[PDB]
Each structure stands twice: as structure tokens, then as C-alpha cells.
Design a protein around this nucleic acid. Structure first.
Ligand SMILES: Cc1cn([C@H]2C[C@H](O)[C@@H](COP(=O)(O)OP(=O)(O)OP(=O)(O)O)O2)c(=O)[nH]c1=O
Ligand SMILES: *Nc1ccc2c(c1)Cc1ccccc1-2
Ligand SMILES: [Ca+2]
Ligand SMILES: [Ca+2]
Ligand SMILES: [Ca+2]
Length: 341
DNA sequence: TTGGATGGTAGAG
DNA sequence: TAACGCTACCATCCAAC
């Protein structure tokens, strides 16, 4: 069982550095500007130079500019990053047929039949890094271990431009020593609940009553953590199948005017339908983000596919439903399609 | 004598 | 002053031959 994981370094920011080499080695911040006012929106990512000053994914641009006014702030050019991603993902395909594309910049390869051992796996990781750097001038981090979770943890430890093997002995050390927060899938909310059960390390999960852990974090996550801690997790590398395709836009001003909201919604539908690429959806959900950033959605599922024209009229009724059942003003509006034929 | 649809939550982007 | 995107999972529920 040998899994090689690839995660591209500071991805959007690094693509902008390849396009404009004068950027390299100084703070670069990639932003989602939203329209609302001067510099409204959020950071998508930033290069490591900018991160030293606290700028990173998620924070508002106005806050980034407070702690790092000097940097290059660039509008996110998603189309260009997807082009670069697709070419790299096709390079990776050449090293293994068992590949799992996990995100715009992540893929797992099952190389159990390609290499005899970790030493050979490591050499293959360098070949992959070299090839990607040659073809795309993009640095990446490679993580290598016995399963997906530890391969991803290996890349986290080695980031940026790194390569790391976590061998059987180091897996045992991490079960003992790794802060549970740093386990994939364990976020702030789950971690804090675990903090209450005395669980700080993966190994702590072995001594706890299974139903107290279940009653706290739910069946799936409890099973997940115990399996990892047991050194048994062995989930297969499988092709990811798109389940939903959606778009959400920020309105210039908050509104409850249907006619004022509709153009944004239709734009979201038009854009969603372009990305569907031959897929035919049987479900549609409208999403409204209210003034206080609560997320509200209403959907409808048909026994048959939804035509683009049908989506327009159905989305209107879903938005009328939200507007009738929630009095708060809408700030963001979007649509999602799912249950593809 | 359990299940698809429903809307909300949490997080490996 | 807080984007954009998408999966897995969770409760809840109104239907159950
Ligand atoms: C986390 C995050 C990522 N992204 C996008 C931009 C990132 O470049 C891309 C990949 O996500 P990540 O791999 O999480 O981040 P990264 O590649 O920018 O940085 P790192 O070196 O630490 O791996 O996805 C967002 O748009 N918003 C986000 O909140
Ligand atoms: N990024 C993003 C885009 C569209 C949608 C979400 C996120 C959540 C959601 C829920 C219902 C419909 C559409 C969307
Ligand atoms: Ca990355
Ligand atoms: Ca990533
Ligand atoms: Ca975490």
C-alpha cells in the first residue's frame, strides 16, 4: 500500500508569479473582489512572503491591507488557474491510472504497483516534481505514505516545495504525537468537542467508550478517527465524481426586490449551465446569504432533467419561497444543480 | 417497522 | 467587513403494506 499525494504550492499566487516573474520573492495576494465598495471581498490565497505578515485565505481584503498594505493585490483569475491545473493533472495521469483528483490543486496516486518500496516512491516523487517544474514552472509538495490521510499529512509537513515519506514507524509516532486538529477532516468545531472528551491525540480515541465518541462527533467521524488510530485506514484511491455544480454572486446592495435580485440569479444559472458540460441535473437549489451571513436554501427535485429554460422559472419560485419564509434582506444569491443523470 | 427528499453544518479547497 | 465552491454527513420528516 503506497499512496503519493501532490499539492501545488500557494497555487493561484504561484500561477500569477509564473505570468509575471517580477512578482517572485515579494508579497502577492490573490483576491475575490465583490463589488460592494472599495476593496470589498476576501483573500483567495497569498504567497509565503505575504503570509509572514498574516495574510491568508479567507480574510477580508480590507483587513489584509491593514496588516500588509505594501503587497501586490491581484483579482482572482480562476479560468487561468484551471487551465494550469488541468495540464498538471494530465501530467500526473502518466505516472498512475489510479488517481483521485481531490481539488483544483491536489491529487492522490496509488503507486503500489509502480514501485517496490518507499525509497523508489521517493525517487518517483522527485521525477514528478521535476516534470511539473519543467513543463509548467510550478513547484509542488509531495507526500508519501501507506494511505491517503498520512500521505496528505506528509505533504503538510513538507510544504512548500517539499517531499516527505511517512514510513510505518513515523505513522506510529504521529498516532501518538500529532495534534488531532491537524488530522484531515478535523476542524475547529470537531477539535473543541474532542478537547472536552480529553481527546488531544489520535491515540486517545482508543481508550474512549465508542458511543460517547459517537454521541459527540457522530458515527462517521468516530469510525474515521478510530480506524486511523488503529493504523487500519485503507480507503481506496477512486475517481471523484462531480455531484453538484453551482454559482453564487454578491449583489451590489442588499435587497428584497425580486426584480432587482433576478438578474444576479439568472447570471448564476447561465454560468452554472456552462459548467455542467453535458451533465443533466434533476435537482435545483437556490441559496440566499442574508444580511447577517446566515445561509438559507430551498430546492426542488424532479423525476427528470431540468432544461436551462426550466431552471430560470423554477429558481424564481424557489427565491419567492425564501423571500416569503425569511424576512431578512439578501446579500448573496446563488443556484446549485445536482442529481445528474 | 427505513427511506428519499429536505435544509442545515463542518471542513481534506 | 467577512468570496467562492463543493463534499460528506447530520437531523428531521412524513410516508410505511
Ligand atoms: C483554502 C483556500 C484555497 N483557495 C484556492 C486558492 C489556493 O491557491 C488553492 C489551493 O488551496 P490550498 O492548497 O489550501 O492553498 P495554497 O496552494 O494556496 O497554499 P499552500 O502552499 O499552503 O498549499 O485553492 C481559495 O480560493 N480559498 C480558500 O479559502
Ligand atoms: N460556492 C457555492 C456556490 C453555490 C452554492 C453554494 C456554494 C452552496 C449552495 C447551496 C444551495 C444552492 C447553491 C449553493
Ligand atoms: Ca496547495
Ligand atoms: Ca490543496
Ligand atoms: Ca484541522
Amino acid at each position: 500500500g503506497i499512496v503519493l499525494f501532490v499539492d501545488f504550492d500557494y497555487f493561484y499566487a504561484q500561477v500569477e508569479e509564473v505570468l509575471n516573474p517580477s512578482l517572485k520573492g515579494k508579497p502577492v495576494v490573490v483576491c475575490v473582489f465583490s463589488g460592494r465598495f472599495e476593496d470589498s471581498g476576501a483573500v483567495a490565497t497569498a504567497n509565503y512572503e505575504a503570509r509572514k505578515f498574516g495574510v491568508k485565505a479567507g480574510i477580508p481584503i480590507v483587513e489584509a491591507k491593514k496588516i500588509l498594505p505594501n503587497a501586490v493585490y491581484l483579482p482572482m483569475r480562476k479560468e487561468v488557474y484551471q487551465q494550469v491545473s488541468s495540464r498538471i493533472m494530465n501530467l500526473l495521469r502518466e505516472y498512475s491510472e489510479k488517481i483521485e483528483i481531490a481539488s483544483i490543486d491536489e491529487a492522490y496516486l496509488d503507486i503500489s504497483d509502480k514501485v517496490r518500496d518507499y525509497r523508489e516512491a521517493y525517487n518517483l516523487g522527485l521525477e514528478i516534481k521535476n516534470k511539473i517544474l519543467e513543463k509548467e514552472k510550478i513547484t509542488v509538495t509531495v507526500g508519501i505514505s501507506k494511505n491517503k490521510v498520512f500521505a496528505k499529512i506528509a505533504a503538510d509537513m513538507a510544504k512548500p516545495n517539499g517531499i516527505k515519506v511517512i514510513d510505518d514507524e513515523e505513522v506510529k509516532r504521529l498516532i501518538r504525537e500529532l495534534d488531532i486538529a491537524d488530522v484531515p477532516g478535523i476542524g475547529n468545531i470537531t477539535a473543541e468537542k474532542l478537547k472536552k472528551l480529553g481527546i488531544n491525540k489520535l491515540v486517545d480515541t482508543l481508550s474512549i467508550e465508542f458511543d460517547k465518541l459517537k454521541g459527540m462527533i457522530g458515527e462517521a467521524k468516530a469510525k474515521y478517527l478510530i480506524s486511523l488510530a488503529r493504523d487500519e485506514y485503507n480507503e481506496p484511491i477512486r475517481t471523484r465524481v462531480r455531484k453538484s455544480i453551482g454559482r453564487i454572486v454578491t449583489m451590489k446592495r442588499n435587497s428584497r426586490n425580486l426584480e432587482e435580485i433576478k438578474p444576479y440569479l439568472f447570471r448564476a444559472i447561465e454560468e452554472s449551465y456552462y459548467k455542467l458540460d453535458k451533465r443533466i441535473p434533476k435537482a435545483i437549489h437556490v441559496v440566499a446569504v442574508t444580511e447577517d451571513l446566515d445561509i438559507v436554501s430551498r430546492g426542488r427535485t424532479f423525476p427528470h432533467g431540468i432544461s436551462k429554460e426550466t431552471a430560470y422559472s423554477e429558481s424564481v419560485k424557489l427565491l419567492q419561497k425564501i423571500l416569503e419564509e425569511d424576512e431578512r434582506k439578501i446579500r448573496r444569491i446563488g443556484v446549485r444543480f445536482s442529481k445528474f443523470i
